[PDB]
């Protein structure tokens with residue numbers, strides 16, 4: 001069988017919390033007044049929700065309303081409980097209210113309003129300094145939620161809201177997030193394809209917070225090299241091949257051998273043999289102003305096959321890449 005694995009940090013946060021903290025199936029939702037919120041416009045529809053801009057008519061302030069699609073009361077209560085546990089943490093989107101939508105017959109989560117610029121256009125204008133700054137802000141959110149026993153499991157540009165005018169960042173969509181319990185096996189069908197960690201792609205279920213750090217590394221690579229997404233697989237198998245063309249196949253075999261994992265035999269005809277590459281080959285005249293020795297070393301220390309070898313969020317915040325970021 002597979003060799004077990006444990007997070008190297010925040011390992012026992014939930015076992016020493018009171019049961020109510022992580023036992024989300026027993027959570028009792030405190031419902032607000034649905035008539036407080038007037039929907040203004042539909043902003044988007046996801047796999048699991050529709051998102052609206054709205055007005056809170058008790059203060060005439062704009063809010064965002066996420067009306068959940070019908071899913072298991074378990075998955076709904078999980079997201080609600082995680083948002084309440086994390087509320088007020090650095091750069092965590094603030095759940096302001098929860099109401100029963102009378103049309104959908106599902107909960108509608110009310111969030112603080114973030115005046116966001118879409119990552120498609122925003123990523124075209126970010127400077128070297130901008131990228132370091134916003135990476136540091138994401139790390140504050142990830143260290144916070146990891147320190148609170150929670151992994152996000154869906155870190156990607158779409159879930160990082162940035163109000164660039166006020167340099168304000170919020171990590172959103174906690175609908176895939178989970179509580180970390182040592183030795184628990186988790187669903188590997190999380191995260192968007194381009195941001196899935198090697199652990200998901202080789203079907204290793206005993207993963208942890210370090211999954212988020214791979215995803216973050218994928219975002220960093222797309223930003224400093226101006227190639228979004230960086231690992232651009234056509235499916236989940238080709239996704240691992242794309243990673244192995246950069247990190248090399250010998251270290252992939254070291255990874256799966258360490259955890260006594262077996263690759264899907266369908267890789268025998270697609271994976272090939274690939275050397276590990278040096279990150280400088282992705283540097284060119286149109287991205288070099290975003291690349292530094294510190295950026296490449298930081299990236300290299302996030303994008304490890306072995307989830308146990310990646311920088312933690314707190315370690316990442318100590319990295320020289322952030323020395324130039326002005327600290328508040």
Ligand SMILES: COc1cc(/C=C(\C#N)C(=O)Nc2nnc(C(C)(C)C)s2)ccc1O
Nearest residue numbers: 043051053064093111114115116172173174
């Ligand atoms: C999909 O889960 C979530 C989504 C959100 C929020 C948004 C999304 N998605 C959001 O605020 N999207 C916007 N798109 N344009 C905006 C203007 C600045 C034009 C008003 S806001 C918050 C918490 C969640 O859990």
